[PDB]
């Protein structure tokens, strides 16, 4: 996407900068900042004086203390009115961070909040299976997980791998087969 392009350029700026972590911190902070629906509307209304919005923008750039590359990224962004198209590019920055990283966030989903050792084994096995540089573990103790788990991995959470009632689905299939 062009939103994904804006995210990719922000990550590129932070990456040739080295501020991928730093502007990632800025990304989370500004995400929680722009999480304010009143702030998101006030920055994102067309009725907003972009003079006064730029005033409040540098005010907010203080009010969370943003890094300079991401600050000018936001300046070009709200300057180019894709602030209206803001937030998901912000969200995509996360994946862009992982696109920078290769730290793959994979969501497990088990009957219990599983063992951090079992989490380590699964993240290691997914670092081999994914072939990953690293793995941001994204756990879940799922209720409909009967006993086993469910690790959505891949580019999306596409690469589902689950043994909870999934084998019961397979058993009902082979019954129906």
């Amino acid at each position: 996407s062009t939103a994904s392009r804006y995210a990719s350029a922000l990550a590129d700026v932070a990456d040739v900068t080295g501020t991928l972590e730093a502007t990632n911190s800025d990304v989370e902070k500004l995400i929680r900042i722009f999480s304010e629906e009143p702030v998101y509307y006030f920055f994102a209304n067309p009725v907003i004086s972009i003079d006064n919005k730029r005033s409040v923008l540098d005010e907010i750039i203080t009010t969370s203390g943003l890094q300079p590359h991401t600050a000018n990224f936001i300046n070009i962004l709200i300057d180019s009115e894709r602030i209206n198209l803001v937030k998901e590019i912000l969200n995509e920055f996360e994946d862009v961070f992982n696109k920078i990283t290769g730290t793959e966030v994979a969501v497990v989903t088990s009957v219990v909040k599983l063992e951090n050792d079992h989490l380590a084994q699964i993240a290691k096995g997914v670092q081999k299976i994914t072939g990953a540089k690293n793995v941001r573990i994204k756990t879940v103790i799922d209720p409909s997980l009967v006993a086993g788990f469910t690790i959505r991995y891949g580019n999306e959470g596409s690469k589902l791998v689950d043994m909870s009632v999934k084998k019961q689905l397979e058993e009902i299939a082979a019954q129906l087969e």
Binding site: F42, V47, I48, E59, S64
Partner: protein, 495 residues
């Protein structure tokens, strides 16, 4: 942080105007508008430069206003304070003679037509339960209309034709005969020429029909919002007459102009265009428009709302989406054939393609007794219209039925504003069926039928009195008609 959130809180408190919405995308009488989200659907709203905005497009983002007219002074970011009222034109009978612009405001200049009851233009339609039987008749003055197609009180009929044809004037002739009628006459002139508007108005007041007639008009230079609703405005004027149980009739100048208007509206709304650029909503829109026209029930007082639809076939498309949509929509339809006008017959009603639904419930039995024979002989001559150039070798009943249908064809034509009563036409039809005009020659029977009408107004006025009182073709009255028929037949037989 609430210092920054205080700063943007003040900025957004400035953005927190409730009724107002700033003019976002000011284009061509249409605006996206920030703010004024909490409005109901479709109201007028006062913009800056006072401007009335028809809140057409309830955008999720914006507030899409059909501007009432041109807003050069409606600047960028012009705040439309929400009015919330929609289309509540003050309708009273005190416009019956005033020529109102779309605000029910006299484009006449007849003074402010005083009016307390204010109805929103699109009020709801009458239910089928809200309508009784179509018993009472309209009467065009056009003998040829009411003969071949009976018009009830409060019914739906189109007049399709071509440009300004005098079909315009055919409606005007109906409006003229509304003066003798007890129905309220209401001239809805969408998009006429201004000179034409005035000559029509002069025709009305010169008839004094403007006593019985109010006038509303859309300009050709109308903001098409006013066009796009002024139809419904006239419909509500009919409501203020018709919920008051009164017979009332309306003359809708061609909603094809309104179709180009709503085309300009939805295209101006950047909305989805339909069959030949008319919006699909034009189907339901004209449907809602013409839907309300009826005689009511007696629960609603049987108040007649008698529509007159102008439909002009664009180079003879009997199936434009406008035209075929109306053709679905109507009950009576009046195709016009200016072939007859070019050959001479005003009224150039295409008597074959002009088909209607109501029929004998709309005719006097007085009329009906003659009119069935008129239909039979008319279709007889209609098939036999082929025989004409070879009618030297025509059989006695063939050339005779040809002569009968010929005199009946003579018994049709009438100029601009040559309306007749029911009774004069009854004499005319009874003679033309009675072969006394199978005697008389072509222009001879025209003048002689005029003279028979005059010398029946004089020489048999009690036959017209019975045809009034009974409203039934009495054999006594048909006898007095034959009496005066032979009398004036002698009078014009000496010539």
């Amino acid at each position: 942080s609430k210092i920054i959130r205080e700063r943007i809180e003040g900025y957004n408190r400035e953005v927190k105007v409730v009724n107002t919405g700033t003019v976002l995308q000011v284009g061509d009488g249409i605006a996206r508008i920030h703010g004024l989200d909490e409005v109901m659907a479709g109201e007028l709203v006062e913009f800056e430069e006072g401007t009335i905005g028809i809140a057409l497009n309830l955008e999720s983002n914006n507030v899409g206003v059909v501007l009432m007219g041109d807003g050069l002074m409606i600047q960028e970011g012009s705040s439309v304070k929400a009015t919330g009222r929609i289309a509540q034109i003050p309708v009273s009978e005190a416009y019956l003679g005033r020529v109102i612009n779309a605000l029910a405001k006299p484009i006449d200049g007849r003074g402010e037509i005083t009016a307390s009851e204010s109805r929103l233009i699109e009020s709801p339609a009458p239910g089928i339960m809200s309508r009784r039987s179509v018993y009472e008749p309209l009467q065009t003055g056009l003998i040829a209309i009411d003969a071949m197609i009976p018009v009830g009180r409060g019914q739906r009929e189109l007049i399709i034709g071509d440009r300004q044809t005098g079909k315009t004037a055919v409606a005007t002739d109906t409006i003229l005969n509304q003066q003798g009628q007890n129905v309220i006459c209401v001239y809805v002139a969408i998009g006429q020429k201004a000179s034409s508007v005035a000559q029509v108005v002069t025709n009305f007041q010169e008839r004094g029909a403007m006593e019985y007639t109010i006038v509303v008009a859309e300009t050709a230079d109308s903001p098409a919002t006013l066009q796009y609703l002024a139809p419904y405005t006239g419909a509500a004027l009919a409501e203020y007459f018709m919920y008051r149980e009164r017979h009332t009739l309306i003359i809708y100048d061609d909603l094809s102009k309104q179709a180009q208007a709503y085309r300009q509206m939805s295209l101006l709304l950047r909305r989805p265009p339909g069959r030949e650029a008319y919006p699909g909503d034009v189907f339901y829109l004209h449907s809602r428009l013409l839907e309300r026209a009826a005689k009511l029930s007696s629960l609603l007082g049987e108040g007649s709302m008698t529509a007159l639809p102008i439909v002009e076939t664009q180079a003879g498309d009997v199936s434009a989406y406008i035209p075929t949509n109306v053709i679905s929509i109507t009950d009576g339809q009046i195709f016009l054939s200016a072939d007859l006008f070019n050959a001479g017959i005003r009224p150039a009603i295409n008597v074959g393609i002009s088909v209607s639904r109501v029929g004998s419930a709309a005719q006097i039995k007085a009329m009906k007794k003659v009119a069935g024979k008129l239909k039979l002989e008319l279709a007889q001559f209609a098939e036999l219209e082929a025989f004409a150039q070879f009618a030297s070798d025509l059989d006695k009943a063939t050339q005779n039925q040809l002569a009968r249908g010929q005199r009946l064809r003579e018994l049709l034509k009438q100029p601009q504003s040559a309306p007749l009563t029911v009774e004069e036409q009854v004499m005319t039809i009874y003679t033309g069926t009675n072969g006394y005009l199978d005697s008389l020659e072509l222009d001879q029977v025209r003048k002689y039928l005029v003279e028979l009408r005059t010398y029946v107004k004089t020489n048999k006025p009690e036959f017209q009195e019975i045809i009034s009182s009974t409203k039934t073709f009495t054999e006594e009255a048909e006898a007095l008609l034959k009496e005066a028929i032979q009398e004036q037949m002698e009078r014009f037989l000496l010539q």
